[PDB]
């Protein structure tokens, strides 16, 4: 198979990194590179990275001065030479057939992107939560319009579980210094695609154990773009109202007063002054 | 007539302030207060303010530590006790019948807001440009939907030439530390109104002699709000695409590289990947 680039930002994850890398080296799909971007870790993460690189030549390390998750992923994208690009968080781990299933689903269907689901692992209790069962398995091709019309966490705000043609990344980078960076970026990759293939399997495990401002501005930017391109807004509008409610209260609790002012005003307009 | 609050931010306008204030004290509509917000001027502006306060008791001065145009206007809004609120830039000046015409247009039509046009004065050549002639005069009542469907400078991004019921300002303030603050605020006041009256007279004179980021996020925010409230997006979408073009090139010229990738990417999507 053609080369897949796995981009893995690493920042102070010494407890979890070995589990992650072991689950990647066990992939049944062999032709990958793993790009570990150590974002200036101050625990043993950087050492663990070096140790794994010494026993598998598919692992490439980039050490860099701490600059945040966006900067780490953008470095991953710049360094990747694969035909495909996928993201794995160093907190998490995957089934041994993860990559292969994503690959087949993309190539056999002629899609530009393939997406699977995830299950969770509760670290506090050391137990899986299998929300996605075999009985609920399905696979499906989508147009972009069908894809954009929906969880919203899996789809828009979570960068892993997805396999991207590398050419999609022309002009697309994660926004610097900001959290909710996936939220701002992943959907722009969808808008580049012609067809997206989804597989409802939980092959990625999300280990389980805020940036209000970005939450709001990401939603506004996404709505403006979709509108300018002629996509339907119904769901994005509901999402936006929901985020405004959360912001209006949480900004106040955090003492983010100008943000509070803004969000309340916006929520006041939508609810009490709609068009007549 | 009921009290009109005229909010006038003052920052280092010693050359122009006397002209502005003289044109205001000559108003045929007498029942106003002028709130001068000296935003920590370092020329003779603050002294000129004090001199005028001594000969007309309708003038109230607020001195404050320099905090920007938004902070100055927000201070004006907080201190205003009028039933109506209007803005005058200290750079500019008005006809003697300016306030009266705005007042009548609002009250006689039962509107929540009245708006007039402006002409310009070229300071370098000391000459008027009468774009708005008497032969092109008209007056008209508008719904918000009719109003929102258009210059765009006069309407959305320019805070003077408009008379607002004071009640409209519940929850509405100019955004701190940002330029294009008018761009972000004025239209939110329109959305509070039931009916807007426009008078096509150039009774305000704009004296004639950048914030790329805000330009873009203001447009995205406005589109998201309007969409959420059910208004039409056609013109805003055209406005947005135009600002992206300007941003894509100007951000690059200024060395604003992350902003440049963002705007190019957005413009690339809109023009080369519209919905299929």
Residue numbers in the entry:
A (entry chain A), B (entry chain B): 4 to 153, 160 to 218, 229 to 295
Which sentences from the paper describe this structure?
Glycosylation catalyzed by a series of glycosyltransferases is crucial for biogenesis of SRRP adhesins in Gram-positive bacteria. dGT1 is a unique bifunctional protein involved in the biosynthesis of an SRRP adhesin Fap1 of S. parasanguinis.
The x-ray crystal structure of CgT (286–582 amino acids) was determined at 2.4-Å resolution. The space group of the CgT structure is R3, shown in dimer in symmetry unit. Each CgT monomer has a triangle shape and contains three regions: an N-terminal domain, a core region, and a helix domain. The N-terminal region consists of β1-β2-β3-β4 and α1-α2-α3. At the very C terminus there is a unique helix domain consisting of three helices. Noticeably, this helix arm is not crucial for GlmU activities.
